[PDB]
Amino acid sequence: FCRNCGEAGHKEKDCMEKPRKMVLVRATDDDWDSRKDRWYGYSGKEYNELISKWERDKRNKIDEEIELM
Amino acid sequence: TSGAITFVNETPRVIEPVYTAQWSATWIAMRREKRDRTHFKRMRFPPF
Amino acid sequence: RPERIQEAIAQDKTISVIIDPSQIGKPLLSMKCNLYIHEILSRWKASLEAYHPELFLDTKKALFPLLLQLRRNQLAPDLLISLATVLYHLQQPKEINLAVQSYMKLSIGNVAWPIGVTSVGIHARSAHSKIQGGRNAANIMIDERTRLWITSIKRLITFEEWYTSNH
Ligand SMILES: [Zn+2]
Numbered sequence: 001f002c003r004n005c006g007e008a009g010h011k012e013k014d015c016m017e018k019p020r021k022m023v024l025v026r027a028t029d030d031d032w033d034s035r036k037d038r039w040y041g042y043s044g045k046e047y048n049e050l051i052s053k054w055e056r057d058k059r060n061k062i063d064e065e066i067e068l069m
Numbered sequence: 070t071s072g073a074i075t076f077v078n079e080t081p082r083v084i085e086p087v088y089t090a091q092w093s094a095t096w097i098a099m100r101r102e103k104r105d106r107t108h109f110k111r112m113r114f115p116p117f
Numbered sequence: 118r119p120e121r122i123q124e125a126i127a128q129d130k131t132i133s134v135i136i137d138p139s140q141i142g143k144p145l146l147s148m149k150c151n152l153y154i155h156e157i158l159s160r161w162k163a164s165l166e167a168y169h170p171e172l173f174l175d176t177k178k179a180l181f182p183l184l185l186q187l188r189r190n191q192l193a194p195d196l197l198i199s200l201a202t203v204l205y206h207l208q209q210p211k212e213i214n215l216a217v218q219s220y221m222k223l224s225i226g227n228v229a230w231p232i233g234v235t236s237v238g239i240h241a242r243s244a245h246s247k248i249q250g251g252r253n254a255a256n257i258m259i260d261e262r263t264r265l266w267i268t269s270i271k272r273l274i275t276f277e278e279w280y281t282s283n284h
Binding site for chain 2: 016017018023024038039040041042043
């Protein structure tokens with residue numbers, strides 16, 4: 001098994017930890033829109049930052065003529 | 070002097086083991102970040 | 118403020134509704150047209166029961182910017198000459214058809230292409246770009262409010278044909 005990780009899965013060249021001196025995966029859907037989707041696993045962080053910025057900006061924010069008559 | 074063309078006049082010299090170690094460090098960091106993020110927003114093209 | 122309104126009503130009983138055809142081709146002509154439109158509205162108001170009553174409020178609202186332009190002498194002269202010709206043939210006793218004909222000169226005009234036509238066929242040529250209607254179009258396509266009052270002049274024409282039919 002890997003020398004520095006201590007897990008049994010991979011090889012010493014494959015260990016994602018930094019070499020020392022001594023996990024959810026996209027489920028395989030194969031629609032071409034689904035592999036090339038820019039917004040995948042989207043929780044809502046960007047929309048919440050947008051709404052919060054707009055709420056702060058909004059919080060900072062807050063007749064007839066003679067002949068017509 | 071009239072502003073026509075602008076050549077970058079510099080050749081990039083690197084030490085070879087130092088450059089190998091720099092690419093290995095950023096290889097490991099990009100793997101760790103792809104694992105760590107659930108949602109990776111690849112940017113849209115063309116940018117402008 | 119009610120003083121100017123009262124003196125203007127006193128001047129409003131003074132000026133008369135007479136369209137002379139030599140006088141068409143400036144401020145007094147606009148006032149005479151303004152007052153003839155008001156008199157048509159008053160002859161509706163005398164007989165509101167027999168018609169459609171549901172069109173009268175909307176007609177007054179759609180006409181009110183036109184009446185404002187005629188009160189302030191701000192109407193464009195090419196358009197006003199056509200409108201005064203409509204209103205002359207409306208004022209005359211029997212030629213109710215020449216009113217609608219000059220109205221068709223008012224609304225569409227003499228433009229070759231009233232509404233633009235774009236991308237007729239598969240084969241594209243440069244001269245097709247002359248066809249389209251942003252440059253020169255009908256008066257009924259200038260603005261959406263102008264559509265309302267030009268339509269309302271036609272509605273007063275139909276009112277007047279009914280009134281000279283019966284009363
Ligand atoms: Zn390992």
